[PDB]
Amino acid sequence: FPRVKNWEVGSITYDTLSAQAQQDGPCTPRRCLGSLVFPRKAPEQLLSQARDFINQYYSSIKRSGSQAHEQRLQEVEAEVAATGTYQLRESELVFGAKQAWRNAPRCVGRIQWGKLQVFDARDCRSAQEMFTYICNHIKYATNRGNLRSAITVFPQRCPGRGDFRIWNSQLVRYAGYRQQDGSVRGDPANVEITELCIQHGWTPGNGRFDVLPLLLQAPDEPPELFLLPPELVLEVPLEHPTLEWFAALGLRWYALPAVSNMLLEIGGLEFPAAPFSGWYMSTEIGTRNLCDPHRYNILEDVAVCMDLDTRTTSSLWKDKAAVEINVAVLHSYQLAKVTIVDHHAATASFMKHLENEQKARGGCPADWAWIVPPISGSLTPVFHQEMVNYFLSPAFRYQPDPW
Amino acid sequence: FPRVKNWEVGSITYDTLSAQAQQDGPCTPRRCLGSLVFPRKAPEQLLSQARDFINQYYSSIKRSGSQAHEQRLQEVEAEVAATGTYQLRESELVFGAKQAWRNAPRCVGRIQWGKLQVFDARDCRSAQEMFTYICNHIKYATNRGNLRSAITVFPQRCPGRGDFRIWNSQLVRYAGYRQQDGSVRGDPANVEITELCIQHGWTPGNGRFDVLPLLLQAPDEPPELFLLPPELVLEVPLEHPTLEWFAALGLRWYALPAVSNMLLEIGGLEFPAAPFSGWYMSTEIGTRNLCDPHRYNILEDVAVCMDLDTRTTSSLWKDKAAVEINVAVLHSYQLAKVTIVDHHAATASFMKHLENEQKARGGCPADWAWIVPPISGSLTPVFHQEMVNYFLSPAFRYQPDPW
Ligand code: HEM
Ligand code: HEM
Ligand SMILES: N=C(Nc1ccc(CCNCc2cccc(NC(=N)c3nccs3)c2)cc1)c1nccs1
Ligand SMILES: N=C(Nc1ccc(CCNCc2cccc(NC(=N)c3nccs3)c2)cc1)c1nccs1
Ligand SMILES: C[C@H](O)[C@H](O)[C@H]1CNc2nc(N)[nH]c(=O)c2N1
Ligand SMILES: C[C@H](O)[C@H](O)[C@H]1CNc2nc(N)[nH]c(=O)c2N1
Numbered sequence: 001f002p003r004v005k006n007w008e009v010g011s012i013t014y015d016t017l018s019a020q021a022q023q024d025g026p027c028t029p030r031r032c033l034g035s036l037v038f039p040r041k042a043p044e045q046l047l048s049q050a051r052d053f054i055n056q057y058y059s060s061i062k063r064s065g066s067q068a069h070e071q072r073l074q075e076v077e078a079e080v081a082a083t084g085t086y087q088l089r090e091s092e093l094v095f096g097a098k099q100a101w102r103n104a105p106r107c108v109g110r111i112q113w114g115k116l117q118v119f120d121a122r123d124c125r126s127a128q129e130m131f132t133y134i135c136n137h138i139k140y141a142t143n144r145g146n147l148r149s150a151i152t153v154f155p156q157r158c159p160g161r162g163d164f165r166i167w168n169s170q171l172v173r174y175a176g177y178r179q180q181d182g183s184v185r186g187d188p189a190n191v192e193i194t195e196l197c198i199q200h201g202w203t204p205g206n207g208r209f210d211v212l213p214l215l216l217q218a219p220d221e222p223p224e225l226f227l228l229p230p231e232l233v234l235e236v237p238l239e240h241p242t243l244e245w246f247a248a249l250g251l252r253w254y255a256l257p258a259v260s261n262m263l264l265e266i267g268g269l270e271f272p273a274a275p276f277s278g279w280y281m282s283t284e285i286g287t288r289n290l291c292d293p294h295r296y297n298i299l300e301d302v303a304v305c306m307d308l309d310t311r312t313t314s315s316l317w318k319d320k321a322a323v324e325i326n327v328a329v330l331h332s333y334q335l336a337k338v339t340i341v342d343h344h345a346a347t348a349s350f351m352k353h354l355e356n357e358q359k360a361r362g363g364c365p366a367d368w369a370w371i372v373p374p375i376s377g378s379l380t381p382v383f384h385q386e387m388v389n390y391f392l393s394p395a396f397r398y399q400p401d402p403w
Numbered sequence: 404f405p406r407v408k409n410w411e412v413g414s415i416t417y418d419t420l421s422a423q424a425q426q427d428g429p430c431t432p433r434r435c436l437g438s439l440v441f442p443r444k445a446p447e448q449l450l451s452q453a454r455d456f457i458n459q460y461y462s463s464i465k466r467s468g469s470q471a472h473e474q475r476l477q478e479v480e481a482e483v484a485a486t487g488t489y490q491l492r493e494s495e496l497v498f499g500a501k502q503a504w505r506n507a508p509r510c511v512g513r514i515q516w517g518k519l520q521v522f523d524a525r526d527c528r529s530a531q532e533m534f535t536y537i538c539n540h541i542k543y544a545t546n547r548g549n550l551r552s553a554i555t556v557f558p559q560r561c562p563g564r565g566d567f568r569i570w571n572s573q574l575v576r577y578a579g580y581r582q583q584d585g586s587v588r589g590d591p592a593n594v595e596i597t598e599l600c601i602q603h604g605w606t607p608g609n610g611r612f613d614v615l616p617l618l619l620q621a622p623d624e625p626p627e628l629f630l631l632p633p634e635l636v637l638e639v640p641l642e643h644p645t646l647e648w649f650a651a652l653g654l655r656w657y658a659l660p661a662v663s664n665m666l667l668e669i670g671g672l673e674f675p676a677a678p679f680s681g682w683y684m685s686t687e688i689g690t691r692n693l694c695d696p697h698r699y700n701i702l703e704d705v706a707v708c709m710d711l712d713t714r715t716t717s718s719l720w721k722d723k724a725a726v727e728i729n730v731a732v733l734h735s736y737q738l739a740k741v742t743i744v745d746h747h748a749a750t751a752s753f754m755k756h757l758e759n760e761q762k763a764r765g766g767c768p769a770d771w772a773w774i775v776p777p778i779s780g781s782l783t784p785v786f787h788q789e790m791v792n793y794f795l796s797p798a799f800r801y802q803p804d805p806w
């Protein structure tokens with residue numbers, strides 16, 4: 001098993017959990033592809049994954065080898081024999097979603113993994129009911145700014161019927177209007193979904209923070225457009241505690257990060273629509289979403305406004321402006337009473353998570369490049385922590401866009 | 404051939420050079436160990452490495468397979484048959500030193516790889532001569548602050564003979580002293596080598612920045628304790644352009660990063676003593692050396708002096724203090740006319756190096772976790788650049804401590 005060192009403390013662990021990694025990553029002894037954004041790209045195989053999952057379930061409740069464990073294994077085996085697939089028990093779906101979060105190598109927020117509200121929407125039958133489920137998710141999770149982690153699980157993939165899909169990458173996203181100059185007004189990460197919304201009859205705005213409609217896909221159905229009720233979309237105007245002109249930038253962000261395009265895989269079953277939400281780490285907004293050159297790209301405007309020497313790199317004008325933007329985000333969310341965590345607190349809690357998981361399971365799949373925050377990397381403890389990246393199931397997986 | 408994307412620009416390249424990776428890294432399809440600091444830990448073997456290097460060499464000078472190529476190959480064959488090793492020609496040594504730097508996946512400064520002064524010390528004998536070679540290295544490389552990359556190559560390992568070894572990890576290091584107060588005065592990274600110099604007759608100081616003596620090891624002799632003439636060790640007292648109290652913290656650092664504990668491998672030959680130097684990237688000093696919790700750990704000291712609110716993480720007092728420490732580093736080296744590069748300029752140049760290397764040989768081994776700076780990660784272009792990590796030879800490799 002790989003030896004894993006913390007270089008801040010000298011402490012040494014061994015990741016015995018990685019030996020159990022089923023699905024393969026992109027690395028080989030010849031070359032490491034750890035930095036790649038996309039690393040990854042029927043009866044007996046399903047049973048192997050199902051059996052393994054049921055084993056995980058009954059371990060988590062300290063009833064391994066029990067009568068109930070054996071009977072449930074036999075029950076899954078019989079259903080897979082009769083139908084080629086099976087249904088999770090409610091309890092299993094809840095456990096499976098929590099495990100999928102727990103297994104997500106790129107999530108720094110996994111200290112929370114046991115605190116997850118699971119909405120079972122597996123009886124959903126239309127895009128309209130999907131919209132209702134989504135609105136209930138948003139209302140619950142937002143909780144008027146006291147954010148609560150939740151996942152809504154729509155029906156699993158099954159042969160002979162199309163998937164449920166939420167086309168939007170997140171439930172709340174700002175329009176990106178591909179301006180004609182090749183530029184973008186709004187969020188450039190959302191130019192494609194924005195144009196698909198327009199294609200499907202949405203009347204666009206012209207702002208930088210226009211909330212997109214939902215394109216909800218029921219099985220074998222073109223996507224259907226649904227407008228989120230404004231009262232359900234909590235937003236935070238950005239201001240800075242000491243730079244009063246900052247508020248005149250007219251920047252905003254939304255309260256609720258609710259990822260809606262990943263596939264949830266539990267015991268070999270696949271849920272292509274299972275949006276999940278937590279709360280933001282402030283660097284996601286302050287550093288990536290606002291300061292990435294290919295996103296809102298506000299770094300230079302702020303630095304110029306702060307009167308920084310932007311003609312020379314060595315003045316660290318980029319670093320100084322980014323810090324103040326991150327300050328504005330944290331200050332603004334706290335002022336709005338919307339849950340948010342800074343990258344220092346998040347990474348400190350992740351270190352506690354790693355320690356819990358070493359005790360609980362003998363390791364923790366972690367993607368160092370994604371866990372270390374995009375600013376102040378070595379100022380956080382995770383920078384100094386060696387990490388082992390591997391794929392466990394249940395899992396949140398990337399999947400092709402449905403168009 | 405791995406596809407490699409830049410996510411800021413969307414451009415795609417294919418790393419065809421990774422296919423030539425000679426050694427095996429720690430990663431497998433089951434688990435990625437790319438974040439590990441220590442990834443790595445007979446005549447037919449030596450010959451096959453020697454041959455491949457000679458082929459590399461003659462290919463790079465467009466003497467592909469010519470008459471000289473065939474004669475050099477036969478020379479090394481007879482040498483190894485006669486002696487068990489062989490001797491590099493001076494130009495092969497220069498070529499091999501440059502390629503070992505060029506191949507170093509964790510070096511962000513490789514845009515400079517074609518410019519390296521190679522001091523051939525292979526005739527060295529006795530630690531006394533080592534010291535002279537090292538002093539001439541330090542003097543040449545420092546160049547009154549106009550730093551110039553240089554390597555001094557001491558005699559290679561060979562059968563039955565000892566090794567030349569520089570016990571110090573760098574030619575310039577500050578001492579670290581412990582107490583039954585528990586803490587360390589000076590650099591905690593150098594506590595081991597500091598007690599060794601003391602155990603070898605050096606009488607210690609009591610300062611935070613006591614430059615260490617050199618512990619040089621001729622083959623099969625005890626290490627000999629040499630003192631660097633203080634006018635050879637150019638240092639930069641650290642001050643801040645606007646925070647006038649920063650100078651009163653008494654911080655300083657040295658001009659010349661000269662790494663003296665890595666092993667240089669060329670053509671199956673191993674040079675355990677081959678110190679190389681360049682110049683610093685500012686984050687190495689201002690972020691890692693001064694702000695790492697297990698190094699000088701000054702961040703809270705600086706934040707207190709900046710009157711920052713250190714009781715909550717969300718004030719980003721750590722980020723603001725780090726930025727000003729990096730400012731002080733850049734300002735102090737520039738005012739002292741000592742070569743230094745900030746992390747924005749260095750990562751921008753590494754992007755240019757990536758493009759040059761894509762053209763030169765179809766790719767470039769790069770370790771994302773080490774190329775991305777330890778502050779302002781995503782504010783630099785390398786953050787958004789997927790990278791392939793692999794081991795090429797000639798190479799610089801870690802090696803066990805002599806003791
Ligand atoms: C409770 C507070 C949470 C915080 C602060 C948090 C934080 C984060 C952050 C900062 C990322 C990286 C996102 C990016 O850079 O694009 C991430 C990734 C991720 N999070 Fe969490 N998270 C939280 C809750 C959750 C929940 C409730 C789930 C699912 C039930 C989840 C699942 C994931 C997954 C699967 C990823 C990886 C996404 C990818 O690979 O692209 N997280 N998390
Ligand atoms: C000329 C200016 C140079 C700059 C600005 C530079 C910058 C850097 C930096 C910032 C690192 C990371 C080191 C750390 O974080 O501890 C590094 C690593 C490295 N550099 Fe460069 N470097 C330069 C020249 C050179 C030269 C001349 C050589 C050898 C001839 C070299 C060989 C290496 C190697 C082997 C590593 C990897 C060290 C390791 O794996 O531990 N570099 N460089
Ligand atoms: N898809 C593309 N790129 C692309 C690929 C991957 C990603 C990953 C972005 N994850 C969003 C995300 C994920 C996880 C967490 C957050 N935040 C949060 N705190 C939370 N949410 C939910 C619970 S916590 C946010 C983003 C973009 C393509 N672009 C062009 C052609 S393909
Ligand atoms: N040695 C230990 N860890 C350890 C392992 C690896 C490293 C890598 C750092 N190499 C120093 C270094 C290397 C390369 C570049 C720099 N900077 C520079 N700009 C230059 N130099 C020379 C030319 S450019 C500095 C550091 C520490 C251990 N600690 C405890 C038990 S083992
Ligand atoms: C190329 C690189 O993998 C890519 O830019 C990654 C790096 N680390 C990241 N880390 C997080 N949390 N989110 C990201 O989008 C990225 N992007
Ligand atoms: C654990 C982790 O690999 C380790 O802290 C690495 C991360 N990236 C780094 N990057 C650089 N340039 N130098 C380092 O020492 C490290 N340390």
Ligand SMILES: [Ca+2]
Nearest residue numbers: 079086087088
């Ligand atoms: Ca049933």
Ligand SMILES: [Ca+2]
Nearest residue numbers: 582583584585
């Ligand atoms: Ca005592």
Ligand SMILES: [Cl-]
Nearest residue numbers: 257284285289
């Ligand atoms: Cl986001």
Ligand SMILES: [Cl-]
Nearest residue numbers: 660687688692
């Ligand atoms: Cl250093």
Ligand SMILES: [Gd]
Nearest residue numbers: 241242243244
């Ligand atoms: Gd003000």
Ligand SMILES: [Gd]
Nearest residue numbers: 707708709710
């Ligand atoms: Gd004061």
Ligand SMILES: [Zn+2]
Nearest residue numbers: 027032430435
């Ligand atoms: Zn890897």
